[PDB]
């Protein structure tokens, strides 16, 4: 209920980007588990570990190591760090002055 997926008018849901980021971390983590239990060619395993690291960093603070990913609609997905910081964040805009 902090990263909710809510039914809109017309059945087209609405989701916060944290679901995208958690999903990208979870797929890559499951694939790393898969490749580890296949004895895969270790260059592919290196790539999986690198991608999982990049995913965890997009999840923790997007646009802090490389370029913001991505988003699905061509705008930088916001992550937990974006949920805290920023003029339009959480410490400022509903924490100090609220409706």
């Amino acid at each position: 209920d902090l990263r909710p997926l809510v039914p809109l008018d017309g059945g087209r849901f609405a989701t916060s980007d944290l679901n995208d980021l958690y999903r990208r971390v979870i797929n890559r983590n499951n694939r790393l588990k898969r490749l580890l239990d296949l004895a895969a060619p270790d260059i592919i395993v290196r790539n999986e570990k690198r991608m999982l690291q990049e995913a965890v960093d997009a999840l923790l603070d997007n646009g802090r190591r490389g370029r913001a990913i991505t988003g699905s609609n061509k705008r930088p997905l916001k992550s937990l760090a974006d949920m805290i910081k920023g003029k339009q964040g959480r410490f400022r805009q509903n924490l100090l002055g609220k409706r």
């Binding site: 909710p4 997926l5 809510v6 809109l8 017309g10 059945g11 087209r12 849901f13 609405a14 989701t15 916060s16 980007d17 679901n19 995208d20 999903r23 990208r24 797929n27 890559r28 694939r31 898969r34 490749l35 296949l38 004895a39 895969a40 060619p41 270790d42 260059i43 592919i44 290196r46 790539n47 999986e48 690198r50 991608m51 990049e54 490389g66 370029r67 990913i69 988003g71 699905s72 609609n73 705008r75 916001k78 339009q88």
Partner: protein
């Protein structure tokens, strides 16, 4: 370096514009990504960069200032420093040789011998052949599918007689345990003409691995008790333990050594005798010695590693192949590297299923498997609300018959028209085209004044309004009043029958057991009380809670 003068220039002026940053860069910095990252360095420290009363603030810093300055001084020499995944992978994939022009068949022969070494290694094992005769008898005695043991060979009934023949040969091999060596070679050469089911073979291999693990664990129980606790000496334990491996002299005639260490193993003496009897007993549980099956699975792991160290090479080449193939879906809602990873996994899949026997070139078939697995993973993990793969295929054929029906019929498809041209019942097509659309992001920038987002207007349909909680506490008070106007019979039985000011509302029998009366009396009492409550002077206050 020159960027040092650039940083001090920005600090002098109090800013830095894109012109000066484009000037003062390391000339052969051809990488726009490290360009962006180095300007993000010079900005993340502060000064702030721009492109053209500039009195706001500094924000930083004496701690991160020298940090970013150090990173800049280093990055002045950062030659091969792309530092992003998609380019690092391309680097380390093109760096490896593309040494594959019908050397695939040589690699395949390597695998062929390596997979036959594991075959002969297992097939030299007595208890596994016992397991195989077991499963021939069970699969022909209806324990599983009739071919649930073998993947063909180099025919139900002559095959059952073949397996009876193999059973006779192996059981006489067991009968003639020197004399046993020639008969086990008989065993090996007579099984060498067969071919098992890879699942049964897999359990075979895993049982060999459990053999290895348990034998090494009893190795640990022998050694660590003295070789790791009493500090049993290394080379003497070597030349005595391995070299004897059977008799009591390795331990019973070694406790009589009275050495500085043989005066240390009387503690574990009976424990290592348990280990000795377990050695000889597991030799029975396997049928043959520990050394024999040990070196058996050793050479088998040799052959398996020999096979694996060639699939590595061909997956290198064919992973260049996969980066080739994958680029047709860069805008399918999935990351490019994730596409390449699914293609790599499918490539290993096809490499273990590629065959030279058809004489087909590798690429056309591995790309078959790769397109399969990549479209699979796209259909699987490209959408938050997972629709199954068949639904994705159905929406795809709907879309493909939609562009066609648009370019032909001029105006637009419609569910009537689509149920015409497609073979669906005019309503599941409705739900399909309802399903296809993506959840809009809850951080969509709304067209408002406050920089508002779509997540700020999503109201709450589960909350009960505080007029509707103070219209329930008022009701609780009203019912407690109107029940107080009543005997303990009616009050207790109504609080108990319903959930009023109590835990779970009981049925009639529980109320009766609390009142020691039968259920029909309870029904009469509660009906009496409700009758009493129905009239005004007991109903006016409750009824005002009914706006109906």
């Amino acid at each position: 370096s020159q960027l040092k003068l650039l940083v001090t220039r920005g600090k002098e002026q109090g800013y830095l514009t894109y012109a000066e940053v484009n000037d003062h860069l390391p000339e052969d910095i051809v990488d726009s990504d490290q360009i962006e990252d180095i300007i993000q360095m010079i900005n993340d420290m502060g000064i702030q960069v721009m492109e053209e009363l500039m009195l706001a603030e500094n924000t930083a810093d004496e701690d991160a200032a020298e940090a970013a300055a150090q990173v800049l001084s280093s990055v002045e020499s950062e030659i091969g420093r792309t530092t992003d995944p998609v380019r690092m992978y391309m680097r380390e994939m093109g760096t490896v040789e593309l040494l594959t022009r019908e050397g695939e068949i040589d690699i395949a022969k390597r695998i062929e011998d390596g997979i036959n070494q594991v075959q002969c290694s297992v097939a030299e094992y007595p208890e596994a052949i016992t397991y195989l005769l077991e499963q021939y008898d069970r699969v022909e005695a209806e324990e599983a599918r009739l071919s649930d043991l073998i993947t063909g060979f180099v025919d139900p009934e002559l095959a059952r007689e073949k397996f009876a023949e193999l059973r006779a040969q192996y059981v006489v091999t067991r009968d003639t345990i020197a004399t046993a060596q020639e008969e086990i070679l008989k065993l090996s050469e007579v099984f060498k003409q067969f071919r098992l089911v890879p699942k049964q073979f897999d359990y075979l291999v895993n049982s060999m691995r459990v053999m290895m693990d348990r034998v090494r664990t009893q190795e640990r129980l022998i050694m660590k008790l003295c070789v790791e606790q009493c500090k049993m000496p290394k080379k003497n334990f070597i030349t005595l333990f391995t070299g004897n491996e059977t008799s009591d002299t390795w331990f019973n005639a070694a406790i009589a050594m009275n050495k500085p260490w043989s005066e240390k193993l009387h503690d574990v003496s009976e424990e290592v005798h348990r280990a000795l009897q377990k050695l000889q007993q597991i030799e029975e549980e396997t049928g043959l010695t520990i050394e024999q099956v040990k070196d058996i699975n050793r050479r088998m792991s040799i052959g398996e590693a020999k096979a694996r160290r060639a699939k590595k090479e061909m997956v290198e080449a064919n992973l260049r192949l996969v980066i080739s193939i994958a680029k047709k879906y860069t805008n399918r809602g999935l990351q490019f590297l994730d596409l390449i990873q699914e293609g790599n996994i499918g490539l290993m899949k096809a490499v273990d299923k590629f065959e030279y026997r058809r004489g087909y070139k590798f690429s056309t078939y591995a790309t078959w498997w790769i397109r399969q697995a990549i479209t699979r993973s796209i259909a699987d993990q490209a959408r938050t609300i997972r629709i199954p793969v068949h639904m994705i295929e159905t929406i795809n054929k709907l879309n493909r018959i939609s562009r066609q029906m648009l370019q032909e019929m001029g105006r637009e498809p419609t569910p009537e028209e689509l149920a015409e041209r497609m073979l669906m019942p005019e309503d599941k097509i409705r739900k399909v085209l309802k399903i296809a659309k993506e959840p809009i992001s809850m951080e969509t920038p709304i067209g408002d004044d406050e920089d508002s987002h779509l997540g700020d207007f999503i109201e709450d349909t589960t909350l009960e309004l505080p007029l509707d909680s103070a219209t329930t506490e008022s009701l609780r008070a009203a019912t407690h009043d109107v029940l107080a106007g009543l005997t303990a019979r009616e009050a207790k039985v109504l609080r108990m029958r319903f959930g009023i000011d109590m835990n779970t509302d009981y049925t009639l029998e529980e109320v009766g057991k609390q009142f020691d009366v039968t259920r029909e009396r309870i029904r009469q009492i509660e009906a009496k009380a409700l009758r009493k409550l129905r009239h005004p002077s007991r109903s006016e206050v409750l009824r005002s809670f009914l706006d109906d």
